[PDB]
């Protein structure tokens, strides 16, 4: 049967297997004709030098343009001849390579995947094409104020470390890049431990490990040095950024303060922290009756067209805050009425109000598990983050940890009288000045 | 564990269930009444009706259900289409009962009160706004006018003067009329069939009345052209394809994945798709090409839809259009059929493999048939399609009166007469 208490017990577990040159193997059985194979890479934008910036991005494009063994667009036809979907993606820390496929055609997949993981056809045929394509995109990327405002925020605090820099980097290196640096950056960071491998589907482990084996037992993929594992504490800077432009209708505005690293107990409490505020946008069926104070009120006068929150925890770092959208003449409102929803927590907070959020996050993580692929993606970050850990039922235990005091202990750390940073984009105009926000973060008890 | 168990009841309402070992416990209700039942004075009903779920039932006050749902941390869902209107509901394994109760009173105990009713007008435009950004959205509805006359062409979105036009009384009639135990189909997921079956006939048995099916929709040729100042035109061309539930619609459903491709490789110029290649060969730089097929009970619509530049428009058209002729000439590669099947089967699976996607596909059968075909036999059915089948099916496409809709600068745009 199924009981939420029992259901934590019956799970196919994650698998652990090692190679000799540092690649890790892992797996879970979905009793499924289909399987999601992927490859995760911890090579971060913050590893690349300033000149190296945007390369991997540029590189990521290059992968499926044909590889060392398999030239351009004979590659896709096969996967298409198979019928398999193929996709990949990047992030300042992490780059992804993965495929949704049946368990049948699995054997080629790896040996297809494996080849391109490192062996790459390097030809200036693409270098200019992509560059132009990218220069096309770079200039086109200015269209969504959303993706705009982020990067400002990184540079705001994280100035002084590569962490803040653009994924895609300056427009100039886009022109200025020789594939030497590519091969060079191909060279350094693509040996193991940097490499992490997994997949999920009807596969169990053994029948993977056999056909894991020899490439990519392997092709090395090595571990020697290439420094170790080079990263540095990134600087957390209380500051502001304002780009005032009066043309557009609305101003995307979000606010943030730095937070803890990936692994930490506090990493848990913060999950429920944002569960408290909730979020409102235009077309939610929410109405005035919503429980969340701002979701109702900031909608009541439509002090916001929309808002949400964000939480991301880096290795040594983490981010906390909300992202919101409203008309300009009223912008002051949200800012005034956002803060207390932090502050009132910091003193007066309550158990029952958490239950729902306690429930929600419970509701949240459970629903995360539908479909083949999502589990596959989890594994990769998990390995790169907590390693093996899939503390599935333990999550609840991690959740059962939570207490009203526990909370009112947490926010005590990172909020009451702290130094925020300010990310904003036109029409900023009416945005309350900095020094208000600062003397506005900590109550006088009012 | 055990696979699909659906029990025909006396009410005509099929209660299907499994049980899982999973903590996920979900339920949804599927009903036959979509847009297609809105008559000239019934317009927009569904469009707005769908938006009502937050109101006060006769069972519960609206405010209550609100603080009701979030307290659970559970979640509610609402969905509509041209055919099957549906509500969807989900929460944790244990507590579904309270929410199960809630599902009842919603469709069970409606209330319509002017102040309650009328105050929700402004939501419409805000609603009707966002979808209309993507012209592809905007393109779909106008299209249905060109291929039909009466019902299917009816929008999912309230016409504009139709907005100040919606009274409560109208709804309640349309409520009961198109709501019957016969037309209501309920699906369980991970829960005991009995608790499903317990409440099943209990609250959900009412009447009777009205499935009134009088819309054959009468596929009818025509085209429509609407002028914007855009630099990227949108245009489509479709011929009537077969009704759903035959290898014929599958032949097109073959024939779509034959020609048409949901992207299997990001950024990739898609070589295995002939048309796209057959386009770019004889054409120039940015554009996008896809063939379109969708079907329903009494018919289906198969064609292609293109987005190119102002001068690019007509060029792409025949280059794409005459390319279609080639397969209609008997040109075929049988291995492609396999790859298509390979694609077709897998892509189908990869859609069905997800729980909720599967959830839909379960009850999609229900309001359609009331049985469950295992995906195996489905796959067998996929193989069953002959090659010349799709060929002659494809022949029909060029072989019949075709419809067009035009979105963009029309400066160079040909009519149907050029085609």
């Amino acid at each position: 049967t199924a009981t939420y208490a029992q259901a934590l017990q019956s799970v196919p577990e994650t698998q652990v297997s090692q190679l000799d040159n540092g690649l890790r193997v892992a797996s879970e059985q979905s009793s499924q004709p289909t399987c999601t194979v992927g490859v995760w890479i911890d090579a971060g934008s913050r590893y690349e030098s300033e000149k190296n910036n945007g390369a991997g991005y540029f590189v990521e494009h290059l992968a499926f343009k044909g590889t060392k063994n398999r030239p351009g667009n004979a590659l896709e036809k096969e996967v298409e001849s198979m019928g398999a979907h193929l996709n990949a993606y990047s992030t300042r820390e992490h780059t992804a390579y993965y495929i949704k496929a049946l368990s049948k055609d699995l054997p080629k997949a790896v040996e297809l995947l494996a080849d391109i993981v490192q062996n790459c056809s390097l030809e200036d045929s693409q270098i200019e094409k992509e560059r132009d394509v990218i220069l096309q995109e770079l200039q086109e990327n200015d269209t969504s104020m959303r993706d705009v405002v982020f990067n400002y925020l990184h540079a705001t605090a994280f100035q002084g470390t590569p962490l803040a820099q653009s994924v895609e980097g300056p427009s100039e290196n886009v022109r200025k890049l020789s594939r030497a640096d590519l091969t060079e950056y191909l060279s350094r960071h693509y040996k193991a431990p940097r490499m992490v491998l997994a997949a999920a589907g009807g596969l169990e482990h053994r029948q993977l490990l056999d056909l894991a084996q020899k490439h990519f037992s392997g092709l090395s993929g090595t571990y020697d040095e290439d420094a170790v594992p080079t990263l540095s504490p990134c600087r957390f800077t209380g500051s502001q950024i304002c780009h005032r432009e009066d043309g557009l209708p609305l101003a995307h505005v979000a606010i943030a303060v730095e937070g803890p690293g990936w692994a930490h107990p506090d990493n848990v409490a913060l999950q429920v922290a944002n569960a408290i505020i909730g979020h409102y946008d235009c077309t939610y069926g929410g109405g005035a009756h919503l429980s969340s104070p701002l979701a109702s009120i900031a909608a009541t006068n439509k002090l916001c067209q929309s808002f949400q929150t964000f939480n991301i925890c880096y290795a040594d770092t983490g981010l906390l805050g909300a992202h919101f959208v409203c008309d300009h003449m009223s912008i002051d409102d949200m800012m005034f009425v956002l803060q207390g929803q932090w502050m009132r927590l910091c003193t007066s907070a309550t158990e029952s109000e958490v239950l729902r959020g306690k429930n929600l996050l419970r509701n949240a993580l459970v629903s995360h598990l539908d479909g083949t692929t999502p589990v596959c993606e989890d594994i990769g970050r998990s390995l790169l983050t907590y390693g093996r850990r899939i503390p599935l039922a333990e999550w609840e235990s991690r959740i059962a940890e939570v207490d009203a005091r526990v909370v009112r202990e947490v926010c005590s750390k990172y909020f009451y009288d702290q130094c925020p940073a300010v990310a904003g984009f036109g029409p900023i105009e009416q945005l309350p000045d900095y020094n208000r926000i600062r003397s506005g973060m900590f109550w006088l008890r009012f | 564990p055990q696979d699909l168990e659906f029990t025909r009841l006396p009410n005509g309402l099929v209660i299907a269930s499994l049980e899982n070992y999973a903590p996920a416990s979900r339920i949804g209700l599927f009903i036959k009444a979509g847009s297609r039942y809105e008559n000239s004075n019934n317009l927009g009903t569904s469009h707005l009706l769908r938006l009502a779920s937050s109101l006060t039932t006769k069972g519960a006050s609206s405010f209550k259900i609100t603080r009701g749902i979030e307290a659970v941390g559970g979640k509610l869902s609402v969905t509509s289409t041209r055919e099957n209107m549906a509500y969807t509901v989900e929460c944790l394994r244990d507590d579904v009962d309270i929410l199960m109760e809630f599902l009842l009173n919603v469709t069970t105990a409606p209330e319509f009160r002017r102040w309650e009713v009328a105050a929700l007008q402004p939501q419409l435009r805000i609603d009707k706004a966002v979808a209309l950004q993507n012209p592809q959205a905007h393109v779909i509805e106008n299209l249905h006018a060109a291929a039909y006359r009466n019902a299917l062409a009816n929008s999912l979105y309230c016409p504009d003067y139709r907005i100040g036009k919606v009274t409560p009384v109208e709804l309640h009639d349309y409520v009961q009329n198109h709501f019957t135990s016969a037309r209501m189909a309920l699906i369980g997921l991970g829960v005991s069939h009995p608790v499903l079956k317990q409440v099943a006939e209990q609250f959900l048995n009412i009447r009777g009345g009205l499935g009134l099916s009088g819309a054959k929709a009468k596929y009818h040729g025509g085209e429509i052209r609407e002028q914007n100042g855009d630099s990227l035109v949108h245009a489509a061309l479709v011929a009537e394809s077969a009704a759903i539930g035959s290898a014929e619609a599958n032949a097109f459903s073959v024939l779509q994945h034959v020609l048409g491709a949901g992207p299997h490789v990001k950024r990739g110029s898609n070589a295995t798709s002939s048309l796209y290649q057959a386009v770019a060969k004889g054409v120039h730089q940015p554009f996008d090409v896809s063939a379109f097929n969708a079907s329903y009970s009494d018919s289906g619509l198969f064609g292609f839809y293109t987005i190119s530049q102002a001068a690019s428009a007509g060029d792409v058209i025949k280059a794409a259009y005459n390319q279609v002729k080639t397969i209609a000439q008997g040109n075929l590669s049988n291995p492609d059929v396999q790859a298509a099947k390979n694609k077709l089967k897998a892509g189908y699976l990869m859609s069905v493999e997800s729980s909720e996607g599967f959830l839909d596909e379960v009850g999609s059968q229900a309001l359609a048939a009331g049985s469950y075909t295992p995906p195996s036999t489905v796959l067998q059915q996929i193989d069953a399609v002959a090659d010349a089948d799709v060929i002659n099916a494809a022949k029909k496409f060029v072989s019949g009166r075709k419809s067009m809709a035009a979105s963009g600068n029309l400066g160079h745009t040909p009519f149907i007469d050029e085609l």
């Binding site: 946008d281 077309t283 929410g286 | 979640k75 869902s77 969905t79 509509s80 959205a137 779909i140 379109f292």
Partner: peptide, 18 residues
Amino acid sequence: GRPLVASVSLNVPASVRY
């Protein structure tokens, strides 16, 4: 192309699809 499309409203979240 599109499904053709769909419509989603419900309570707390929402979006439009194809």
